[PDB]
Structures are given as structure tokens and as C-alpha cells.
Structure 1
């Protein structure tokens, strides 16, 4: 079925992956190197075995394709996947000066001073960001995220180059070139970053009709993480596709450290337990055509029914 490369790669981390420490000491079963393929005209690649959210992914990528680096658009839509490095700056600031938020992050689940205070301090940081039009700019604006990596990579001699703007040109004009890449690894910025980009590079292809794309995620979390990432670039591939004029072909997901978490063992065993129901259908607003102008309403999802959702505990 369309989603069986994810399953065949989760039962491959699980019993074939070796135990890696990793950074936040909770161990992995790593493997290094995996290409999995998805042909997108059979249907759309998110999982029917385990509920994955589609308005979140939509709003997020939609957010990355405006080059917008501000959570205030994300909050407006109801997305807060990005919240915690923002707060990492707010509660480490000069203005924070209140009720201690040090390490909020994994003192949570460990209750004590942390379950309702780190959480009261979050709706306090958000709301401020949705309204104070300056609070929004000092802390809610992330600087280096995929919208600036993507559409305003800062040059060595003083300004903004929109990569994806030009690549959507080079597909529109020179379809068949082996240079159609957008890159997120910039090393000025790598040594001093929160999380360096995890979807490091990606290259489009024009088969004859049919745009394809290959990603190089460098680091991948299986169970949590890789359901999400397979769909963002299946949407990117799907959205660039509709703007060049071309049919959709296929998305290749290539990984470096693909690893399942040691929390996520039982939950991934639970998932494999089940059968793929038929892959979902996505349609796109055909009257809009410039993709960077896509209101939310313009990307759609024709019958999706997963199972059950699943709890993995708190990643990082």
C-alpha cells in the first residue's frame, strides 16, 4: 500500500537498528542511510495506520513558504509545534522577570513546580505574541527557520536571496537540470543554533511531466517525526508541481540517522499491529496558481481515516 515504506523502515530500526546513546541520553536504534520512495499519484503519503494532523502541517509549511519566521501567524492558525525555542529565548531574557522557567521542557512530565506554571507562562508568552505588536517582534520572531533559510538566505556580502523563488523559476524555464536544489545547511549559522535544519537539502526533478523531489534529512525520529516530515515535502512537491504546470510524480525521502526512540518501542510495536486502509486523496485550489498565495482553504484532504492516534511520551 502507499505507506508500506514507513512500516518496513520502522520494523527495520526495531530489530536491525543498533543501540545509539544519541544526545538527550534516551537512546536510539539508529541506522544510517535509507532511501524510501513514494509515488504521489497513487494517492497522498500520510499514514492511515495512526492519526497524523493535516491542518498543522498545512499551516506550518504554508508558514515556511511565506518566509515568515513569526509564530504569530502560526498561533493565529492554531499551530504551536514551534513555541519552545521562542520561549527558550523569552524565559532566558532580560524582560522575563518573573516566576522562573528554567528547563520547563523536561521538568514537565516530572510535574512539580512545572506542569501548570511552565504551562501558564506559555499562554502568557503566546497571547502577548498574538497582540502586542512589538512583543511579537522581540521574541516571537525566530530569525532562522525554514522561511529565511528557504526564501532569504543571508549573503556573505549584505542581503536576502530567495532560493525557492529562483528554483520555481529554473523549473519553469530549464526543467531538466541536475542543479534544482534548495539548501538549509548554512555553516555561519550552524555552530550557534538551536537545532540546525533537520531536512538539510532537497532537489527537484522534471521526469517528463511529473516533478519529483529528493530530501536529505540528516536526523530523523521514527514514530514521532517521520510521519510528519514525509507529508510536508509531499505537500511542497505537491504545491510546486501545480505551479510549474506539471503532473506529480514521486518523492524520495533520504535519511542519514533514522532512528526509533527507546520510549516509542511499544507504541511503534502497536502500530505495526495493524492494516493499511486506502491512501488519502488531496486536491488543490486550481483557480489559485501562484503558490505563495495559498489560504489554508486552498489545499484539501479527501478521505483519510486513520486508526486510533497514539501517545508517544515527551520527545525534545
Structure 2
């Protein structure tokens, strides 16, 4: 995608060298923002093939409030194997905070349902927010959230969303994260009878790992293809009733895939 490739070249041109938690070494820029008008098409990178199956199953996984990789395994998705423990648990990550953020006084807040109610009865609210950044449970998480905070907004019957990603593996993570949220927006929109608007991505520590430099130049030498189309064949009773088959991506003809190591 143009925005994607332009970001890559931005890291290579202004990035500074930094060591990191994984001892892998990176090229890093701090603070960036890009927009995707969802009506121009589904933002799934084409300069290299992406695995839809993984992207979609991970989202339904989050929405169910699951934090164990069993479900993912049942559907052949292994993107979260490296961090799960003996029992498949990852700790109170994304899914848990999204559906059951534990308050001090013994309550649990379902942020996803809260947002839906807000989009239907108070769409002008400047507080339609979902946060995975639960300071209290950060130490029980196998990995601190990367896409940590996001906000919805409405205008002219169009649903928009901004995500703040504090850490971003540009080559390996960004492609999945962008598609994942663009997908949520379509789901939210369809449930609230709104049209899709913009998906605004904002990054904190945006980087390219040292052992991703070749792959990066390879991909950066290719011409972006036309964006695919997302077709939802059904309208479930609730945001929690979507299934893998309700989705259908049309016109996805991407360049060849490129492989790279996953910094653990």
C-alpha cells in the first residue's frame, strides 16, 4: 500500500539504531500517523501475500474475550505460540481487557459492549474508547499490548477509528494489525447501521528489525496493487456472533510472500 511503503522508507531514511528487549537490534522512528479511507477498499497489503485466516481468527478470538491459544490452534493459527505458557495461556491480554477489565471494587467492564451502546445512543460522545493498557495487570501479561488504545468517532453517518500502537514491528506486525482493525470497523459499522469512514493509525516506537532489512528492500521495490474488497455475507444478532465464513475478500492478487524471523 502507498501509506505502508512510504512509512517503511521513512524508517530507513530517518530511523536511528536502537537495541531492544529481544536483543535483535532495530531501526526506529518515534511518532507517526497515516490514514486509510475504508471506502477506497480493504487495507490488506499487496506488496507481499498476507495470511487472512490468521488475521480473522485472532480478532474473533479477541472479541470472545479469550486469552488461551486453544481456540487459535483449533483453527490452525500459530501466530501466538511463542509466548503462550504450558497451558496455552497468555495472561490478561487483549481479549480479557476488551471484555472484562477488572475494577478495584470487584466489577468487570465490558468495553466492547459499552462502545456499541455508545455508538447507538451517543455517537457524538468524545469518549468512545477501548483500552488494553491495564497498568494493574501488566505484570501478568506474556507481552504488553502493542495496539493499546483506540477511539471511535462518527460524522455524516460514517464510522471512523484511531488506534495508538505504542510498539510496532513494521515488517511483520503492522500488516496484520492494520487489517485487523479495519475489519473491526466494518463489523462495528454493520452492527450500528453506519457506513465505514477512516481508520487512522498512530504509532509510538515504529521500527524495522535488523534481520528484516533485506526483505524490506525487496518489498519496497514492488508496485502496490489495487486494494481488495471486503464482503460480509451476513448480519449477526450481535458483534459477538460473527464467524469466519461470514467474511469474504474479493480481488486479492498480491505479489509473492516474503519470509522473516519473528523477534521473541
TM-score by length of 2: 0.96
SS at match of 1:14: helix
Matched, 1:32 2:36: no
Match of 2:143 among 172, 195, 203: 195
Which residue pairs with 1:311 in the alignment? 259
Which residue pairs with 1:120 in the alignment? none
SS at match of 2:263: coil
Greater share of residues in strand = 2
Matched, 1:177 2:125: yes
Aligned pair in 2 of structure 1 residues 142, 17: CA closer, same or farther (>3 Å)?
closer
SS at match of 2:14: coil
For the 8 Å contact 2:22–2:263, the answer to whether it is kept is no
Shift of 1:234: 0.5
Match of 1:238 among 186, 191, 215: 186
Shift of 1:295: 1.3
Matched, 1:156 2:154: no
Alpha-carbon distance between aligned partners in 2 of 1:75 and 1:203, rounded to the nearest angstrom: 30
Higher mean displacement: 255-264 or 65-74: 65-74
Q: CA RMSD in A?
A: 1.3
Which residue pairs with 1:42 in the alignment? 40
Higher mean displacement: 6-15 or 154-163: 154-163
Which residue pairs with 1:60 in the alignment? 58
Shift of 1:48: 0.9
SS at match of 2:217: helix
Shift of 1:222: 1.2
For the 8 Å contact 1:242–1:289, the answer to whether it is kept is no
Match of 2:234 among 279, 286, 294: 286
Which residue pairs with 1:18 in the alignment? 16
Alpha-carbon distance between aligned partners in 1 of 2:155 and 2:208, rounded to the nearest angstrom: 33
Alpha-carbon distance between aligned partners in 1 of 2:249 and 2:107, rounded to the nearest angstrom: 38
Task: Give CA-to-partner distance per residue, 1:24-50, whole Å, 9 cap, x none.
Answer: 222211111001110000100011110
For the 8 Å contact 1:198–1:218, the answer to whether it is kept is yes
Aligned pair in 2 of structure 1 residues 69, 23: CA closer, same or farther (>3 Å)?
closer
Shift of 1:215: 0.4
Which residue pairs with 1:272 in the alignment? 220
Instruction: State the structure with more CA Rg.
Output: 1
* Structure 1 stretches of 4+ moved >4 Å: none
SS at match of 1:264: helix
Alpha-carbon distance between aligned partners in 2 of 1:224 and 1:48, rounded to the nearest angstrom: 14
Shift of 1:192: 4.4
Alpha-carbon distance between aligned partners in 2 of 1:43 and 1:59, rounded to the nearest angstrom: 21
TM-score by length of 1: 0.81
Unaligned runs of 5+ residues in structure 2 are: none
Shift of 1:142: 3.6
SS at match of 2:135: coil
Unaligned runs of 5+ residues in structure 1 are: 91-138
